[PDB]
Design an enzyme around this catalytic site. Sequence first.
Site, PDB file in Angstrom:
ATOM      1  N   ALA A 240       0.826  -1.207   0.000  1.00  0.00           N
ATOM      2  CA  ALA A 240       0.000   0.000   0.000  1.00  0.00           C
ATOM      3  C   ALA A 240       0.858   1.254   0.000  1.00  0.00           C
ATOM      4  CB  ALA A 240      -0.915   0.010   1.219  1.00  0.00           C
ATOM      5  N   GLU A 243       1.559   1.053  -4.495  1.00  0.00           N
ATOM      6  CA  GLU A 243       0.519   0.796  -5.492  1.00  0.00           C
ATOM      7  C   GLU A 243      -0.431   1.951  -5.693  1.00  0.00           C
ATOM      8  OE1 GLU A 243       0.210  -1.030  -7.851  1.00  0.00           O
ATOM      9  OE2 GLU A 243       1.329  -2.860  -7.467  1.00  0.00           O
ATOM     10  N   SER A 245       0.051   5.096  -4.970  1.00  0.00           N
ATOM     11  CA  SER A 245       0.762   6.271  -5.461  1.00  0.00           C
ATOM     12  C   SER A 245       0.990   6.139  -6.963  1.00  0.00           C
ATOM     13  CB  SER A 245       2.098   6.436  -4.724  1.00  0.00           C
ATOM     14  OG  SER A 245       1.895   6.678  -3.338  1.00  0.00           O
ATOM     15  N   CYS A 350      -6.414   7.094   6.153  1.00  0.00           N
ATOM     16  CA  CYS A 350      -5.101   6.876   5.554  1.00  0.00           C
ATOM     17  C   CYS A 350      -4.062   7.829   6.126  1.00  0.00           C
ATOM     18  CB  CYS A 350      -4.986   7.338   4.100  1.00  0.00           C
ATOM     19  SG  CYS A 350      -3.335   6.853   3.512  1.00  0.00           S
ATOM     20  N   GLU A 359       4.759  12.658  -2.753  1.00  0.00           N
ATOM     21  CA  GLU A 359       5.080  12.004  -4.017  1.00  0.00           C
ATOM     22  C   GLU A 359       4.275  12.560  -5.191  1.00  0.00           C
ATOM     23  OE1 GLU A 359       6.456   7.587  -2.307  1.00  0.00           O
ATOM     24  OE2 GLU A 359       4.476   7.862  -3.178  1.00  0.00           O
TER      25      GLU A 359
HETATM   26  C1  HEM Z   1      -2.657   8.173  -3.241  1.00  0.00           C
HETATM   27  C2  HEM Z   1      -2.332   7.294  -2.150  1.00  0.00           C
HETATM   28  C3  HEM Z   1      -3.164   6.648  -1.207  1.00  0.00           C
HETATM   29  C4  HEM Z   1      -4.538   6.486  -1.110  1.00  0.00           C
HETATM   30  C5  HEM Z   1      -5.638   6.986  -2.025  1.00  0.00           C
HETATM   31  C6  HEM Z   1      -4.806   5.748   0.092  1.00  0.00           C
HETATM   32  C7  HEM Z   1      -6.085   5.424   0.550  1.00  0.00           C
HETATM   33  C8  HEM Z   1      -6.384   4.863   1.784  1.00  0.00           C
HETATM   34  C9  HEM Z   1      -7.709   4.566   2.260  1.00  0.00           C
HETATM   35  C10 HEM Z   1      -8.988   4.782   1.459  1.00  0.00           C
HETATM   36  C11 HEM Z   1      -7.606   4.002   3.492  1.00  0.00           C
HETATM   37  C12 HEM Z   1      -8.733   3.493   4.426  1.00  0.00           C
HETATM   38  C13 HEM Z   1      -9.240   2.087   4.054  1.00  0.00           C
HETATM   39  C14 HEM Z   1     -10.329   1.584   4.992  1.00  0.00           C
HETATM   40  O1  HEM Z   1     -11.023   2.432   5.596  1.00  0.00           O
HETATM   41  O2  HEM Z   1     -10.505   0.348   5.113  1.00  0.00           O
HETATM   42  C15 HEM Z   1      -6.175   3.922   3.745  1.00  0.00           C
HETATM   43  C16 HEM Z   1      -5.615   3.391   4.881  1.00  0.00           C
HETATM   44  C17 HEM Z   1      -4.253   3.284   5.148  1.00  0.00           C
HETATM   45  N1  HEM Z   1      -3.252   3.711   4.293  1.00  0.00           N
HETATM   46 FE1  HEM Z   1      -3.444   4.840   2.644  1.00  0.00          FE
HETATM   47  N2  HEM Z   1      -3.636   5.483   0.777  1.00  0.00           N
HETATM   48  C18 HEM Z   1      -2.620   5.954  -0.054  1.00  0.00           C
HETATM   49  C19 HEM Z   1      -1.252   5.816   0.212  1.00  0.00           C
HETATM   50  C20 HEM Z   1      -0.713   5.251   1.378  1.00  0.00           C
HETATM   51  C21 HEM Z   1       0.707   5.129   1.652  1.00  0.00           C
HETATM   52  C22 HEM Z   1       1.826   5.833   0.888  1.00  0.00           C
HETATM   53  C23 HEM Z   1       0.845   4.398   2.780  1.00  0.00           C
HETATM   54  C24 HEM Z   1       1.990   3.892   3.403  1.00  0.00           C
HETATM   55  C25 HEM Z   1       3.364   4.264   3.228  1.00  0.00           C
HETATM   56  C26 HEM Z   1      -0.511   4.126   3.221  1.00  0.00           C
HETATM   57  C27 HEM Z   1      -0.814   3.410   4.374  1.00  0.00           C
HETATM   58  C28 HEM Z   1      -2.089   3.206   4.871  1.00  0.00           C
HETATM   59  C29 HEM Z   1      -2.368   2.461   6.081  1.00  0.00           C
HETATM   60  C30 HEM Z   1      -1.359   1.743   6.972  1.00  0.00           C
HETATM   61  C31 HEM Z   1      -3.699   2.490   6.251  1.00  0.00           C
HETATM   62  C32 HEM Z   1      -4.443   1.798   7.385  1.00  0.00           C
HETATM   63  C33 HEM Z   1      -4.900   2.831   8.404  1.00  0.00           C
HETATM   64  C34 HEM Z   1      -5.678   2.226   9.551  1.00  0.00           C
HETATM   65  O3  HEM Z   1      -6.368   1.206   9.343  1.00  0.00           O
HETATM   66  O4  HEM Z   1      -5.611   2.781  10.662  1.00  0.00           O
HETATM   67  N3  HEM Z   1      -1.457   4.704   2.391  1.00  0.00           N
HETATM   68  N4  HEM Z   1      -5.428   4.496   2.705  1.00  0.00           N
HETATM   69  C1  LIG Z   2      -5.211  -7.605  -1.107  1.00  0.00           C
HETATM   70  C2  LIG Z   2      -6.008  -6.844  -0.052  1.00  0.00           C
HETATM   71  C3  LIG Z   2      -5.289  -5.593   0.514  1.00  0.00           C
HETATM   72  O1  LIG Z   2      -5.011  -4.719  -0.588  1.00  0.00           O
HETATM   73  C4  LIG Z   2      -3.845  -4.006  -0.774  1.00  0.00           C
HETATM   74  O2  LIG Z   2      -2.935  -4.094   0.067  1.00  0.00           O
HETATM   75  C5  LIG Z   2      -3.728  -3.128  -2.008  1.00  0.00           C
HETATM   76  C6  LIG Z   2      -2.501  -3.483  -2.818  1.00  0.00           C
HETATM   77  C7  LIG Z   2      -3.697  -1.670  -1.605  1.00  0.00           C
HETATM   78  O3  LIG Z   2      -3.606  -0.866  -2.803  1.00  0.00           O
HETATM   79  C8  LIG Z   2      -4.902  -1.208  -0.725  1.00  0.00           C
HETATM   80  C9  LIG Z   2      -6.183  -1.133  -1.580  1.00  0.00           C
HETATM   81  C10 LIG Z   2      -4.531   0.157  -0.047  1.00  0.00           C
HETATM   82  O4  LIG Z   2      -4.162   1.099  -1.075  1.00  0.00           O
HETATM   83  C11 LIG Z   2      -5.415   0.929   0.973  1.00  0.00           C
HETATM   84  C12 LIG Z   2      -6.680   1.529   0.348  1.00  0.00           C
HETATM   85  C13 LIG Z   2      -5.817  -0.051   2.094  1.00  0.00           C
HETATM   86  C14 LIG Z   2      -4.670  -0.779   2.854  1.00  0.00           C
HETATM   87  C15 LIG Z   2      -3.734   0.224   3.507  1.00  0.00           C
HETATM   88  C16 LIG Z   2      -5.238  -1.737   3.917  1.00  0.00           C
HETATM   89  O5  LIG Z   2      -4.928  -1.626   5.101  1.00  0.00           O
HETATM   90  C17 LIG Z   2      -6.193  -2.847   3.425  1.00  0.00           C
HETATM   91  C18 LIG Z   2      -6.643  -3.727   4.601  1.00  0.00           C
HETATM   92  C19 LIG Z   2      -5.452  -3.688   2.301  1.00  0.00           C
HETATM   93  O6  LIG Z   2      -4.199  -4.173   2.844  1.00  0.00           O
HETATM   94  C20 LIG Z   2      -6.161  -4.866   1.588  1.00  0.00           C
HETATM   95  C21 LIG Z   2      -7.491  -4.371   0.973  1.00  0.00           C
END
Ligand code: HEM
Ligand SMILES: CC[C@H]1OC(=O)[C@H](C)[C@@H](O)[C@H](C)[C@@H](O)[C@@H](C)C[C@@H](C)C(=O)[C@H](C)[C@@H](O)[C@H]1C
EC number: 1.14.15.35
Length: 403
Positions: A240, A243, A245, A350, A359
Amino acid sequence: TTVPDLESDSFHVDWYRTYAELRETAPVTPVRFLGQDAWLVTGYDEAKAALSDLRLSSDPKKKYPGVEVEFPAYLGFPEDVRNYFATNMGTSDPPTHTRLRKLVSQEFTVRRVEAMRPRVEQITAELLDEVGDSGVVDIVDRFAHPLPIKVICELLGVDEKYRGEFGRWSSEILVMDPERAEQRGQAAREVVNFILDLVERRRTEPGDDLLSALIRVQDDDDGRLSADELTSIALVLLLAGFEASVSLIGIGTYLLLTHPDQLALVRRDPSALPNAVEEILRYIAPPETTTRFAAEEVEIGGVAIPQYSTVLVANGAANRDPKQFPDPHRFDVTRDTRGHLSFGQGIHFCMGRPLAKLEGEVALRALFGRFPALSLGIDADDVVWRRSLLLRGIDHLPVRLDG
Ligand code: HEM
Ligand SMILES: CC[C@H]1OC(=O)[C@H](C)[C@@H](O)[C@H](C)[C@@H](O)[C@@H](C)C[C@@H](C)C(=O)[C@H](C)[C@@H](O)[C@H]1C
């Protein structure tokens, strides 16, 4: 009468017009997907409420009497690999979620992110010097994809092992095809094996990377990360961490290329680039849908969702809800983007937002500033969109560097 099928082409061809039709009929409706019954939430108010209602669990590891919890995203994943994919904050409910997120936040800070700004500028500069000054190039393969990968690999200390192959495993995972279920589960096993070796390697040879720091992190009350927690967190941060980004950069490039008016405005006023990244996320959210499980019967938008139901919140559709964002189908770098759901909402909001924005801004600024005549290399309506409700993106994007 007819329950929609998320596997039909209606959801992968001008699919936003299909979301608009459903939302107008019912922001919460029954659907079929991967052979199972589910509920799709396409309304903004409904989606926000859903993600904020904790009766809707994010943990696929929980067991309930006489029920088989099946998250689509894990299609074809053996039991043990799924557990490795799902023992992290995104797949945990409070209080577990609370402690996992706090321990990670102690090391994955804005400070550590900001400290990588120069490195990101340099990587971006290097990739661009290598594309040349003319001709057609796949901007995804030569820029959008490598950039995020190099950044996440340096943050986590990934060097050895299939540093160029995990990209291949990650791809198969982004698609959920009942046909390729076996190949999907095999790729997932490969990523797990890869993470296990990486973590063990790092334990043996510590560094200043984020992974080394998480191995040593500890709190008085919260304690520390278990071996399995540590492994799963590394795994998701790696996948995550890049992908999404890649999607942001590819889709962002495509959008500015097809909206000269919007691109001109960005080149003119640079201080307007941050909001452009936000509108890019609102317009076409990479994580089109997010999954939740109803541990109890919950009512959303006046519709009772029965206990033990799988709920698919269409973040992407919600961002196009006219009631929240006027003239939703219009890409506007100047519009108010407050409240969009592309980064989530609530306790799972997120954690990589700062890195993602960093980025996106650096990449698009360098790209369009380096090539004033940059143009699409193919017909706009011929761009091929990835068929995934999990993570939308563009796998191949031909651009003409010198017009
Ligand atoms: C354009 C980039 C990104 C988008 C649109 C995105 C989107 C999201 C979304 C929609 C969620 C919530 C999913 C849910 O509610 O089940 C999420 C969670 C999270 N994202 Fe991002 N993400 C992005 C990039 C990143 C990057 C760069 C990292 C890590 C280096 C990251 C790490 C995480 C983590 C660890 C969570 C889990 C948070 C939690 O459950 O407390 N994300 N992201
Ligand atoms: C195969 C299932 C998993 O998907 C992935 O890891 C995908 C490659 C990522 O792109 C996902 C969609 C993320 O971008 C964030 C939106 C959510 C992420 C941070 C989570 O915590 C979430 C539980 C995720 O790990 C799973 C849905």
